Design a protein around this nucleic acid. Structure first.
Ligand code: ADP
Lengths: 109, 85, 97, 96, 444, 80, 96, 109, 96
DNA sequence: CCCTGGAGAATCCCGGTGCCGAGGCCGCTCAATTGGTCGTAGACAGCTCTAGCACCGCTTAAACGCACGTACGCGCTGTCCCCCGCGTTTTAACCGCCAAGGGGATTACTCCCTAGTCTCCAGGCACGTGTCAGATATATACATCCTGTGCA
DNA sequence: GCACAGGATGTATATATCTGACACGTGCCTGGAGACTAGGGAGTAATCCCCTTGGCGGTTAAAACGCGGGGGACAGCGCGTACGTGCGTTTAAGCGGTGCTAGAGCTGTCTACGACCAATTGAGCGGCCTCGGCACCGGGATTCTCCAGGGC
C-alpha cells in the first residue's frame, strides 16, 4: 500500500518545480548539503518575482492594446519600475528598445 | 594579375547608421568628428568581447563561435544579455 | 518657395520614431564582416553561428545607445545642443573605460 | 528524436495565466523569462553559498536563502518576497 | 486520328511535323488526365508548342479560364512576342515592374479579369503570391522546370500552394544530379502517386514509369548541318609554385576554410592567393604563364588556333581566373571580349553583337560558365576551351552547345584542361557518373 | 541622539576635495556631499547589519564590513 | 602686510593632501554618524574599532573618486569651480 | 619503511604551498574533483603576480629612501602600472593615498 | 591557546627576500598582500569552476586554470603567467 | 612689463627615542606516503544539420554626393558677488587612564536531519496540428508646422 | 513687431486579408516521490576572558566667525562656420539559389588511467618571547617660491 505520490510544489502551494530546484541546488556545487525548506523558499521567491514582472508586462500590453507579451513590453515593464530597474540595472533585453525620453532643453520653444 | 580593394570593414558602420543610433540615444545635433570616434569605440568593445568568446571556444576544443560563448563573454564583461540562452 | 521644415523638427521626429521602434539600426552584412575581420587577428579559421553575430549586434547597439545618452547629458551640461568627441571621451572617462 | 532541454516555460505560463488570464506570450519573451529566472537563481544560490562559507557551515538552509534575498533584492521587493517564502515554508512544514 | 496538321488558329506559317506530333501528344495528354514533362530540348521552340496547347484549349474547349506561365525575366519579352505573333487570339498580359506598376496592373487588368493568359516571372510570382492565390488556375506552365528541381524551396512550395487543375513542366535537362530532384519534379506534377521519396529490376521499370508523364526528342531529326564535336582532355602537370602551394594547403596569414575550393583555384593559378605574387612592382611579364601549366599550354595552343580557323571561346567558373586571363591577353596583344555576371545587360548584348559580326577583328571571347542567359548566339566561333569543368555535366553541355547553335555550320572542338592527380580528377569522375546516369535514364 | 550628520564639517570636506584635486568649491557643495555620504553609508551599513544578524551576533566586524563592500563591488584590502 | 593671491594656498594644500596618506575626517564624529545610521536597522548594536576604521576608509575613497569626476565635469564646462550640478552629473553617469 | 617526504612545492620548484592550495580547492566547493596539475599551476601564477607587485613596490620604496614596504608604496606601484591598475581597478587599499595629478588648466598662468 | 590562523605571510616574505634581498615589509602591507592573494585565488578558482560547469565536466584541471588566467589577467601578464605555470607543471610532471 | 628684493614655505643634514619587525624556540596538526578501487573522460563510430567559398540572378531600399540657408558655437566684454586668505575666539577631539560587564569564542554532548538506496509512477517534453493575433495595406480624419499678411 | 488663416505635411484611426507562430492534445520515459537506514553536522548548555562601553580631566589643534578684496561666473553681443534638409544618383544590401564537405551535437560502447578514500607519520607552520635597526620626532641652516613695486 503506497500513498498517492503528491508533489512538494502542491504541498507548499507553489506553481514552480520544487523538486527541480532541489536537484539543481545539489548539482550546482554551492554547498555539500541542502536543507529541505531551502528549495521551497527559493521557488517561492522566484514565483513572486516572475509574477511581479508578468503583471507589469501585462499592464504594458494593455497600454499598447495587444493581448500578447513581447520583449518590448518586458523592457517597458522592467523600466519605469525603480525596484526592477535596480535589480536589472546591467541587463540587456534583446529587441527591447529604450524608453521615450527627450531632454527639456532640446524641445522647441 | 588584377587586384582591387573595396573599403575598410569598419567603414561599413555608416554615417546614417551612427545618426540613427544617436537619434535613439536622444541626440539632436551631431558634430562631424563623432563618426571616427564611434567607430574606434565599437572596435575596442568588439575586440574585448570577441577575445573572451574565442577564449571560451578554444577551451571547449572547437572552431565554431556560439551564442552561448558570446553570452558568457558579455556576462564576464558585466553586460548580461537576455533572450539568447 | 518650396516647403522646408526648420532645422531641428525632422531630428525630433526621427528621435521619436527610433525611440518607439525596436529593430536593429546597423547593416547585418557589414557588421558580420567587421566581426570576422576582428576575430581573424585573435585566431584564424573561425566559423560563426548566425546567433552569435546577432547577439553581438544586440550588445553593440545597446552599448552605443547608452554611450550616446550619456554623451548627450554631458553636452547639455556644457550648455550645448551638439555632441562632440570631447563629450564622448568625458563619458568614457567617468564610466571607467 | 531531439534531446531534452529543461526550461521554466511551463511554470512561467502557469504564473501568467494566474495573474493575467486572457493574455499570451511570445517565444522570445519566454526565453527572456527563462534567462531571468536562471540569473536570479544563480545570484541567490551563489550568495547563499558564500554565506555558508563565511559562517563555516556545509548546509544551505531557508535562513541562508532569506538572508541572500535580503542582501540582493532592493527593499520592498525583499520584504514581500521574504513574507512569501515564510508563508511557503510554513505551509510545507505545518501539514506535510 | 489526332491533331495531325498545323492548327487553323495558328498564324505565321504552319507548324512543322515533328512539332505537331508533340502538339497532338500534349492534346492527348490533357484528355488522358495526366500531367507530363516536355523535354524535347532545343528544337524549333517549346514556346510554340505550349502556345498551341493553350490556344487549342481556349478555342476548341470552352475554357478560357485563368492560365499562368512562369518564365525567366530574360525570356518574358520573347514569350510575349511569340504570343502576339503566332497565336494572336490569346490576350496575354505581362506583369513586370516596380510596386506602383504591380498595384496599377492588378487593380486595372488583373482584378477586372478580362485576360486569359498571364505571363509572369519567378520574382513577380514570389512578390504577388497573395493576389495570385485568389484566382482559380486552370493551367500552370513552368518554363525551365529545372529551377524547381529542389524541394523545400520557396518557389517550389509557393507554386504548389496554388489552386491549379492542370500542370505542365518544360525543361531540356530534367536530370542534372540525381533522382531525388526528378522525384521532386514528379511530385509537383502529381503528388497523389509520387508520395514516397523512394537491367530487369531497374532501367526498364524506370523507363516504363517515366514514359507516361515524360517525353524527349533528340536534335537529330533534320540535322543537315551542325557538325559534331571533338572532345579532348589535356592533362597538364602542376608548376613549381602550384606544387608547393598544393602541398602546403594539403598539410594545412592565409585563410583556408573550404579545402576543396582552395585546392581548385590553386590548381588553376597560385596568384588567386595572397603572397604568391612576385614583387610589389607587379610586372605582368611571363610570370602569369610560367607559374601555371594551363597557362603554358594555353599560350602554346592559342597561336596555333589563330594560325588556323581561330575565333576561340573560353569558359571559366571563376571571375578572378577571368581577370588573370584578361591581363594575359591584353599583355600578349590579343583583342578580347568578356561576358561576366557583373556585366550589365546592355554591355552583354553589345559585346555579343559585336563578336557575332561575320567580319570581326575580335578573337577571344571569355564567358563565365553559368553566367549565360541560356541564349547567346555565338555561332561564329570555332574552338571551345573549357578552362575548368563544373560538377554539372549538363551545365558543361549547355556551355558546349552554346557554340553548337543552328547558326554554326563548322565543326567545333572542345578542350578540357585537367590537372592529373588532383581534385580536378575527382570533379571529372563525379561529372562522368552524373552524365552516365543522365544518359541511361533519359536518352536510352 | 541626532544632529550628527553636521559633524562632517566644511573644512574636512574641503580637505577631501583638495585631495581629489579641485581648487575652487561652491558654497552649496557641503549639503550635497553630506547627502551622498549618508546614502552610501546607509547602504553599506544595511548590508553589514544583515550579515551580522545572520551570524547571530550583536557586534559588527571588519569582516562584515569587508564582505558588504565586496558584494557592492568596492573591495577593500587591508583588514582581512 | 604679506598676503597670497586667491589660489596659491589652494594649490599648496592640493599638493600636501595628495602627498599625505592619512584620513581626513574626525574619528569621533564619524563614529557617532555610523552609530546613528545603524540605529535604524537594529537596537543596541555594538561595533569593533576596525569596522569604523574600514567604513571611514571606504567613505573617504569613494568621496575622493567622486570629487575627481566632479572636477573633470567642471573643467569640461569651462569652469574652475565645482558645483552640485557637476556632482549630480558625475553620479548620473556613474549610474547612481 | 617510507622515503623522506618531498614537498610538492619543492618538486615544482615553487615557494607557495601547493598542498594548501589543493586543500583549499577541495574545500571550496568549486567542483567535485581537482586534478594533479591545477594546484601547481595556480601556485605558480600566484607566486608570479606576487613577485611582480612586490618588485614594483620595492622599487618605489627605494625611490622614497626607505627599506620597508608600506601601503603607500603598494598603491604607487599598483597605480603606476597599466596591467596592475586594470587588474585592481575596483580595489581600495587602506592608507594608500592618491596619485599626484593636477589638471593643467588649474596651474597658474 | 586560541584557534590558529592560515595566511600566505611566510611565502610572501620568502618571495620578497628572493626578489629584493635587502627590503622588509610592514604588517599592514603583509595584510594587504594576503588579501590580494586570497582575492586572486578566489577569482581564478571561481572562473575555473564556471568553465567546468559550462563544459559539462566534473574536474578542475590545468586547462581550466590556464583558460581562467587568460580570461582574467590582461595581456602581457597573462602571457607571463601562462609561461610560468606551464614551466612549473612541466617540472612537476618530469620530477615525479 | 620684465627685473630686484624681501617674506614665507619647503628641503636638507644631525641627533635622541621607542617600538615594531626579524629571529629563534615549542608543540601540533596536516600534508606526504603507500595501498586499493571505481568511474570519468578520452577514443571511436554512426547519423543529421549548419556553415563556408566560389558564383549567379533580380529588386529596391539605403547610402552618397551636393547645394544652400540658418541656428549655433565660440570668442570678447562688462558687472558684481561670492569665495578665498587671514586673524581671533571657542569648542571639542584626543590622549591617557580607569572600571565594569556583555558577549564572542570554545568545548562537550546528543539529537535529528540529510545523504544514500530502492522502487514505482505520473509530470514534463518532443511532436503534430489547426486557427487567430497581428502585420500590412488603404483610405479618411485630424494634429502640427510654417509662412505670409494684415494691423496697431 | 506681433497675432491669426490656411496650406501642406505628417500622423493617428478604422477596417479587410492573410499567414505563421502559439496553444493544445498525445504518447512515453525519465526524473521525482514514498519508504527506510546510517552517521555526523548542528543545536544547546556552560565557561572564560577579552574587547567593548561609560566616564573624567587637561592640551591643544581644529573649527567657527568675521572682514576685506579680487578673481571667476554669468549674461549679452556679434559673426563666420558647420550642420540640417531636400534631391538626384549610384551602390550594395537583401533575398533566393548551387555544389560540396567538414564541424558539431547526440547517441551508444569501451576501457584504462587518474582521482578519491583510508591509516600513519613526521616535518612544516603557527603562536610566543625577545632584542636591535629603522622610522620618527625635534631642531637648525639652507634653498626655492611668489608677490609687490618700479625703471626698464
Ligand atoms: N518560322 C519558324 N517556325 C518554326 N520554327 C522555326 C522558325 N524559324 C526558326 N525555327 C526554329 O526554331 C529554333 C530556335 O527556336 P528555339 O530556341 O528552339 O525556341 P525556344 O527558345 O522556345 O526553345 C531554330 O533551331 C529554328 O530551326
Amino acid at each position: 500500500t503506497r500513498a498517492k505520490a503528491k508533489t512538494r510544489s502542491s504541498r507548499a502551494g507553489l506553481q514552480f518545480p520544487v523538486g527541480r530546484v532541489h536537484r539543481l541546488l545539489r548539482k550546482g556545487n554551492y554547498a555539500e548539503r541542502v536543507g529541505a525548506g531551502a528549495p521551497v523558499y527559493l521557488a517561492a521567491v522566484l514565483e513572486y518575482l516572475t509574477a511581479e514582472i508578468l503583471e507589469l508586462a501585462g499592464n504594458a500590453a494593455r497600454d499598447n492594446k495587444k493581448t500578447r507579451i513581447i520583449p518590448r513590453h518586458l523592457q517597458l515593464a522592467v523600466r519605469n519600475d525603480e525596484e526592477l530597474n535596480k535589480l536589472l540595472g546591467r541587463v540587456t533585453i534583446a529587441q527591447g528598445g529604450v524608453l521615450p525620453n527627450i531632454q527639456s532643453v532640446l524641445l522647441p520653444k | 594579375r588584377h587586384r582591387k580593394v573595396l573599403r575598410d570593414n569598419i567603414q561599413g558602420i555608416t554615417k546614417p547608421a551612427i545618426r540613427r543610433l544617436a537619434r535613439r540615444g536622444g541626440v539632436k545635433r551631431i558634430s562631424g568628428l563623432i563618426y571616427e570616434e564611434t567607430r574606434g569605440v565599437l572596435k575596442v568593445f568588439l575586440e574585448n568581447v570577441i577575445r573572451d568568446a574565442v577564449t571560451y571556444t578554444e577551451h571547449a576544443k572547437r572552431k565554431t563561435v556560439t551564442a552561448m560563448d558570446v553570452v558568457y563573454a558579455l556576462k564576464r564583461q558585466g553586460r548580461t544579455l537576455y533572450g539568447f540562452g | 518657395k518650396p516647403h522646408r521644415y526648420r532645422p531641428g523638427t525632422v531630428a525630433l521626429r526621427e528621435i521619436r520614431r527610433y525611440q518607439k521602434s525596436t529593430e536593429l539600426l546597423i547593416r547585418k552584412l557589414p557588421f558580420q564582416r567587421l566581426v570576422r575581420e576582428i576575430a581573424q587577428d585573435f585566431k584564424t579559421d573561425l566559423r560563426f553561428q548566425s546567433s552569435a553575430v546577432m547577439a553581438l549586434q544586440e550588445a553593440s547597439e545597446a552599448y552605443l545607445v547608452g554611450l550616446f545618452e550619456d554623451t548627450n547629458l554631458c553636452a547639455i551640461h556644457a550648455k550645448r545642443v551638439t555632441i562632440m568627441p570631447k563629450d564622448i571621451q568625458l563619458a568614457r572617462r567617468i564610466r571607467g573605460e | 528524436r531531439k534531446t531534452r532541454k529543461e526550461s521554466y516555460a511551463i511554470y512561467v505560463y502557469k504564473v501568467l495565466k494566474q495573474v493575467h488570464p486572457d493574455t499570451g506570450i511570445s517565444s522570445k519573451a519566454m526565453s527572456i523569462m527563462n534567462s531571468f529566472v536562471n540569473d536570479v537563481f544563480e545570484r541567490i544560490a551563489g550568495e547563499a553559498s558564500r554565506l555558508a562559507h563565511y559562517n563555516k557551515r556545509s548546509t544551505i538552509t531557508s535562513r541562508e536563502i532569506q538572508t541572500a534575498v535580503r542582501l540582493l533584492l532592493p527593499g520592498e521587493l525583499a520584504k514581500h518576497a521574504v513574507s512569501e517564502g515564510t508563508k511557503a515554508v510554513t505551509k510545507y512544514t505545518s501539514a506535510k | 486520328t489526332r491533331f495531325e496538321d498545323s492548327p487553323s488558329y495558328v498564324k505565321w506559317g504552319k507548324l512543322r511535323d515533328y512539332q505537331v506530333r508533340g502538339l497532338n501528344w500534349l492534346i492527348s495528354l490533357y484528355e488522358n488526365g495526366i500531367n507530363g514533362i516536355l523535354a524535347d530540348e532545343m528544337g524549333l521552340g517549346k514556346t510554340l508548342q505550349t502556345i498551341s496547347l493553350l490556344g487549342y484549349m481556349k478555342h476548341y474547349r470552352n475554357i478560357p479560364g485563368p492560365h499562368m506561365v512562369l518564365v525567366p525575366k530574360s525570356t518574358l519579352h520573347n514569350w510575349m512576342s511569340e504570343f502576339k505573333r503566332w497565336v494572336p487570339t490569346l490576350r496575354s498580359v505581362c506583369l513586370i515592374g516596380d510596386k506602383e506598376q504591380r498595384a496599377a496592373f492588378v487593380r486595372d487588368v488583373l482584378l477586372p479579369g478580362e485576360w486569359d493568359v498571364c505571363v509572369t516571372s519567378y520574382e513577380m510570382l514570389i512578390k504577388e503570391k497573395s493576389v495570385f492565390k485568389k484566382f482559380n488556375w486552370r493551367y500552370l506552365v513552368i518554363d525551365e522546370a529545372h529551377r524547381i528541381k529542389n524541394e523545400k524551396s520557396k518557389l517550389s512550395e509557393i507554386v504548389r500552394e496554388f489552386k491549379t487543375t492542370n500542370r505542365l513542366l518544360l525543361t531540356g535537362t530534367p536530370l542534372q544530379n540525381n533522382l531525388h530532384e526528378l522525384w521532386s519534379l514528379l511530385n509537383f506534377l502529381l503528388p497523389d502517386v509520387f508520395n514516397s521519396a523512394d537491367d530487369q529490376k531497374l532501367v526498364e521499370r524506370l523507363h516504363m514509369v517515366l514514359r507516361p508523364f515524360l517525353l524527349r526528342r533528340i536534335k537529330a531529326d533534320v540535322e543537315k548541318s551542325l557538325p559534331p564535336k571533338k572532345e579532348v582532355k589535356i592533362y597538364v602537370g602542376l608548376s613549381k609554385m602550384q606544387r608547393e602551394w598544393y602541398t602546403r594547403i594539403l598539410m594545412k596569414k592565409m585563410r583556408l576554410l573550404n579545402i576543396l575550393m582552395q585546392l581548385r583555384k590553386c590548381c588553376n593559378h597560385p596568384y588567386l592567393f595572397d603572397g604568391a605574387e612576385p614583387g610589389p612592382p607587379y610586372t605582368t611579364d611571363m610570370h602569369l604563364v610560367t607559374n601555371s601549366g594551363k597557362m603554358v599550354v594555353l599560350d602554346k595552343l592559342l597561336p596555333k588556333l589563330k594560325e588556323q580557323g581561330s575565333r576561340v571561346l573560353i569558359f571559366s567558373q571563376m571571375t578572378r581566373v577571368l581577370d588573370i586571363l584578361e591581363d594575359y591577353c591584353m599583355w600578349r596583344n590579343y583583342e578580347y571580349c568578356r561576358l561576366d555576371g557583373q556585366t550589365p545587360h546592355d554591355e552583354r548584348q553589345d559585346s555579343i553583337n559585336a563578336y557575332n559580326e561575320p567580319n570581326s577583328t575580335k578573337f577571344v571571347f571569355m564567358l563565365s560558365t553559368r553566367a549565360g542567359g541560356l541564349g547567346i548566339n555565338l555561332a561564329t566561333a570555332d574552338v571551345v576551351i573549357l578552362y575548368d569543368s563544373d560538377w554539372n555535366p549538363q551545365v558543361d553541355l549547355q556551355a558546349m552547345d552554346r557554340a553548337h547553335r543552328i547558326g554554326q555550320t563548322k565543326t567545333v572542338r572542345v578542350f578540357r584542361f585537367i590537372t592529373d592527380n588532383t581534385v580536378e580528377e575527382r570533379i571529372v569522375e563525379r561529372a562522368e557518373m552524373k552524365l552516365r546516369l543522365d544518359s541511361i535514364v533519359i536518352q536510352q
